[PDB]
Design a protein around this nucleic acid. Structure first.
Ligand SMILES: [Zn+2]
Lengths: 469, 75, 158, 106, 83, 77, 78
DNA sequence: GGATTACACCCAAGACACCAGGCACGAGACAGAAAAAAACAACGAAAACGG
DNA sequence: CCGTTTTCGTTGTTTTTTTCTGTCTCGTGCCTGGTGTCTTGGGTGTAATCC
């Protein structure tokens, strides 16, 4: 064994030498990517205000306003409030939340409006008001009325108008970053098809089986129940194409990871999965053999279809399959799942939400919680695009640590290890603020610090290898 | 060792003050106690982290400690 | 209500107040700010009145009549750090579908509060003498709150 | 719910047979030490002719039903079902001859 | 002199540092007291045995071997301090 | 009462034992003791698994619950 | 012979353990765990038997093997 | 004449689970106060060795 | 049990700066609401044994 541990550890010295050549390489390729001229041209990012208006002319204000009461215009999303005989309009966007309190014969309703200082949950990027230190804001207005029923109806209608506005803004955002795609060109002959397929994410709240068709510039999923629930995916927009057979699964999978996100029903997604499920002493052993036949049948058919998709792409799309033997267990989201390496990506496709990490997009891997006799560790992927959030994989068993380190080395990904869960929300924002200064001071190559740098030890006893008495 | 050496000494003496009054301690007794205590607590925090991850969380809460001590067989 | 940012609202208030000599007023027998509720989850100001209790929350205001309080529980948590005050309310408080028949408040045991009751000496003597203290010294917040609830709802603290 | 032990002919609740076994046939059947399939194969809930025996030694009926060497209690004149071939061979190994009480053999 | 309530000498950073060595990222505020109680119950169980050994040897000083035997009795064998 | 049938457990025991030494004999009391110990162990394990499942705010026990319980006990590394 | 531990038996063991709902992989997981346990215990027992120069596995070997693991059993001659 | 009943099946509810929205209590950020920690020198109880 | 050596435990003081904290805003994850569809009950209804 001693000569094998010497051999294995010399291969581990080559592993460390590769890791050192990877840190030096990335340090050189961070100093070359960011120049001092880009640092001088620093871009200050400012909160964008979505401009809105209630009315342009006094004629636009409805004639129903004549009542000296709260009048709501759903068409213009406006809440006209009687302030000292003034028909003051308040857009539903400016409105925040409302509280109704029937005190005595009067119904006191306090309508709150957006005000800076831990206000709405909306991110800084989009502000419901224009930025202004010298701007004063109407924070709340309280009204009373003798008529309780109408005042309750008015409050319901304000709340409904806000819900409809928020829903429309979410629907817009789920279609916003989605790039306007070209139209799918139908195949003029009999298209190749895969029947009885489920799609994820589903276009409707009802799970329905559909048919997947191959066309000239993409694939089309089409539900038999409704023609309007078509999902078109262009070959140009597929980044990665995965197939996964039933090696342990109750299901077979064809997964399309996209370059640009698509709007399927109400959800924006980078991932579109097509799947089917197998699920429905010698007799029980024979029933397992019949399930193994049904697995092999669906595996063969879906693999063939995924190869036929790759062929139809004219060499734009390679068909990837997971290496199950190189798989490790971890928690990227909220469940423990088997993470599977492929040729070019780290994937999890069985449970939603899906994980697809492209290995080429990784800048550095950090192993958190790694120290003296630890039960488990976490793995963090940092991307070359610093605007992209870091990906965490939690609770990877410590038994898999040396395997994960080897695998990262075999893929040319630099890694570092730490006893503490470093915050990346902090690390990234500092790196985004000045990427050049970051690499100037040592980037991640200095942070690695592979050198043990330990010479203190614990002294030594009188060195005497001689029999005493 | 993460805990210091004098607050821990005072804690140990305070606890020992119940079983026999005015007891002396020895060179490597407090050190061994601190090593054992820290090893024990680190193992307990490992189990607590495992439970917290099991619950799909990242924050350890007292009920995770209680579950860990229940499964270990601790009273 | 206006929000005036910058270091500016005090100067704005002074000018307005001086213009028409506005006189400040004080209401609510007693108020307790920033109380942590476990159920409903959130932070609430508790304002107590002769006939009713108000819970003021950023998103939800509740008015509970003193008659609708059935039971008050004052229970130490087993962590020996927090103290629970629990109100049984009938009808149960509503946020939409499911309801809150029990309000669960969580105090720190080391949290001390000094509170003077907003009552005239004639009203205190006639209605509240032997039910409430005129001033509570710097005692634990949960004790003061439990005594005030006992005095105003006439319910026994369990 | 009551079942009739095929071998001795006694009738007891099936759960009683499962939990405690046959008080008479346990020397050759091990009904308590047997699974539900063996309990069914040796105790049948389908039977006919409930019989109560007080004194096995002097009751001519017990001798006629060959239950004079068993515990007094509930017995069945006819029991639906017979012992399985494997259990028959196991009993023949012990040297005990099995006479069916199904009535089809006489 | 009697020692009174020295459990608070296990300050927040010791417990936090112990958690970080244990791999814990976010720590609830009720943990620190929880941990303190746990530690108390541990030490009281170990010390009661160490003292039992010390008193049986008719000694007045708690030695390292007493602690080692007390730990060994609980399946807590410790290398480095004798054995 | 024992919840496993006797003959299947005996066959399993003999199958396992045959991998260490051929022509081994077992007293019936040895099999009975093994069955008692195995069921007691499995019931304790199922109690810990149920505790883990309830901790995760669920009702259905899952293989990950078993693995977590066995890891926390100190049985799997 | 590991298929002799049927699904109803595992269900019964879980019901005596208080388990209300059971996944479908629990059965295979339990079979694996039981196999590991039995492997260790029978290995220890056979070690005891071989040392005693016997060809029959007694109840004393099982009892000492359980005492070795820490699973002390009463009522079998211990 | 009379009655309780077996038996298949429909219309329906309780339950563990999945998905969505939002509000607050925690993390992140920054400037400030605190005492744990580090370093120093002195005295001698008591641990390790011997007959 | 009694006498010896000399380590390291107890005693006290000065200085440093990492850790604790007061304060703010934002967000992410805890909790309430809407919904799935399965296992099962309670019932109708057709049909029947029993004396
Ligand atoms: Zn019988």
């Amino acid at each position: 064994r001693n000569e094998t541990t010497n051999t294995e550890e010399e291969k581990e010295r080559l592993r460390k030498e590769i890791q050192k050549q990877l840190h030096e390489k990335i340090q050189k390729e961070g100093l070359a990517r960011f120049n001092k001229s880009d640092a001088q041209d620093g871009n200050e990012n400012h909160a964008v205000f979505k401009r809105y208006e209630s009315y342009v002319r006094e004629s636009q204000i409805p004639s129903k306003v004549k009542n000296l009461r709260i009048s709501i215009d759903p068409k213009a999303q406006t809440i006209i409030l009687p302030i000292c005989g003034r028909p003051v309009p308040f857009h539903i966007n400016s409105f925040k939340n409302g509280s109704k309190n029937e005190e005595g014969d009067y119904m006191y309703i306090r309508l709150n409006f957006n005000s800076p200082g831990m206000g709405s949950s909306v991110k800084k990027t989009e502000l419901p008001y224009e930025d202004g230190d010298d701007k004063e804001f109407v924070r709340s207005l309280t009204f009373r009325s003798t008529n309780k029923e109408r005042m309750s109806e008015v409050f319901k209608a304000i709340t409904e108008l806000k819900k409809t506005a928020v829903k429309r803004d979410q629907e817009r955002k789920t279609m916003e970053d989605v790039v306007a795609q070209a139209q799918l060109v139908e195949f003029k002959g009999r298209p190749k098809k895969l029947e009885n397929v489920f799609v994820r994410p589903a276009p409707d709240s009802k799970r329905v089986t559909g048919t997947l068709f191959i066309h000239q510039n993409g694939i089309r999923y089409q539900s038999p129940v409704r023609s309007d629930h078509r999902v078109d995916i262009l070959f140009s927009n597929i980044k990665h194409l995965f197939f996964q057979p039933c090696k342990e699964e109750l299901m077979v999978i064809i997964h399309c990871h996209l370059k640009t996100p698509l709007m399927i029903g109400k959800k924006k997604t980078f991932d579109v999965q097509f799947y089917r499920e197998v699920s429905d002493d010698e007799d029980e052993l024979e029933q397992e053999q019949e399930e193994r036949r049904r697995k092999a049948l669906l595996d063969k058919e879906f693999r063939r279809f995924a190869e036929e998709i790759s062929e139809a792409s004219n060499g734009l799309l390679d068909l990837e399959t997971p290496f199950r033997e190189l798989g490790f267990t971890g928690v990227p989201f909220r469940s423990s799942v088997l993470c599977l390496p492929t040729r070019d990506c780290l994937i999890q496709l069985i449970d939603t939400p899906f994980l697809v990490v492209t290995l080429e997009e990784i800048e550095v891997a950090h192993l958190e919680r790694v120290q003296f006799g630890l039960k488990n560790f976490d793995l963090v992927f940092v991307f070359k695009d610093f605007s992209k959030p870091v990906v965490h994989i939690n609770t990877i068993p410590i038994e898999m640590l040396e395997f994960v380190k080897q695998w990262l080395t075999d893929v040319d990904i630099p890694y570092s290890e730490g006893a503490v869960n470093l915050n990346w929300g902090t690390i990234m924002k500092t790196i985004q603020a000045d990427p050049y200064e970051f690499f100037e001071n040592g980037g991640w190559s200095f942070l690695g610090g592979g050198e043990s740098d330990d010479e203190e030890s614990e002294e030594e006893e009188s060195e005497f290898q001689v029999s005493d008495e | 060792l993460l805990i210091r050496k004098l607050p821990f000494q005072r804690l140990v003496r305070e606890i020992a003050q119940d079983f026999k009054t005015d007891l002396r301690f020895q060179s490597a007794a407090i050190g061994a106690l601190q090593e054992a205590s820290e090893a024990y607590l680190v193992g307990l925090f490992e189990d607590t982290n495992l439970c917290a991850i099991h619950a799909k969380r990242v924050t350890i809460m007292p009920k995770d400690i209680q579950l860990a001590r229940r499964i270990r067989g601790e009273r | 209500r206006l929000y005036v940012p910058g270091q500016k609202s005090q100067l704005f208030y002074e000018q307005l107040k001086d213009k028409a000599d506005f006189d400040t007023t004080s209401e609510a027998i007693v108020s307790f700010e920033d109380i942590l509720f476990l159920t409903p989850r959130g932070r609430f100001e508790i304002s107590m009145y002769a006939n009713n209790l108000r819970l003021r929350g950023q998103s939800y205001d509740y008015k509970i009549q003193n008659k609708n309080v059935l039971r008050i529980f004052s229970l130490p948590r087993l962590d020996d750090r927090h103290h629970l005050v629990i109100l049984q309310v009938d009808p149960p408080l509503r946020q939409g579908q499911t309801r809150y028949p029990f309000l669960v408040m969580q105090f720190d045991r080391n949290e001390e509060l000094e509170v003077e009751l907003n009552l005239s000496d004639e009203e205190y003597k006639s209605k509240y003498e032997g039910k409430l203290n005129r001033s509570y010294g710097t005692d634990s917040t949960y004790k003061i709150l439990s005594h005030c609830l006992r005095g105003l709802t006439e319910r026994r603290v369990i | 719910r009551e079942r009739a032990c095929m071998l001795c002919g006694i009738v007891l609740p099936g759960r009683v047979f499962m939990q405690n076994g046959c008080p008479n046939c346990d020397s050759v059947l091990n009904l308590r030490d047997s699974d539900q399939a063996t309990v069914n194969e040796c105790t049948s809930s389908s039977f006919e002719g409930l019989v109560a025996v007080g004194d096995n030694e002097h009751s001519w009926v017990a001798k006629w039903l060959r239950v004079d060497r068993f515990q007094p209690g509930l017995y069945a004149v006819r029991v639906d079902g017979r012992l399985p071939s494997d259990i028959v061979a196991a009993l023949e190994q012990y040297g005990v001859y099995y006479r069916p009480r199904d009535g089809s053999v006489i | 002199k009697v020692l009174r309530d020295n459990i608070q000498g296990i300050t927040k950073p010791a417990i936090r540092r112990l958690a970080r060595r244990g791999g814990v990222k976010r720590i609830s505020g009720l943990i620190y007291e929880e941990t303190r109680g746990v530690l108390k119950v541990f030490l009281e169980n170990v010390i009661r045995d160490a003292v039992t050994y010390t008193e049986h040897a008719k000694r007045k000083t708690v030695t390292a071997m007493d602690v080692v035997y007390a730990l060994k009795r609980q399946g807590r064998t410790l290398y480095g301090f004798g054995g």
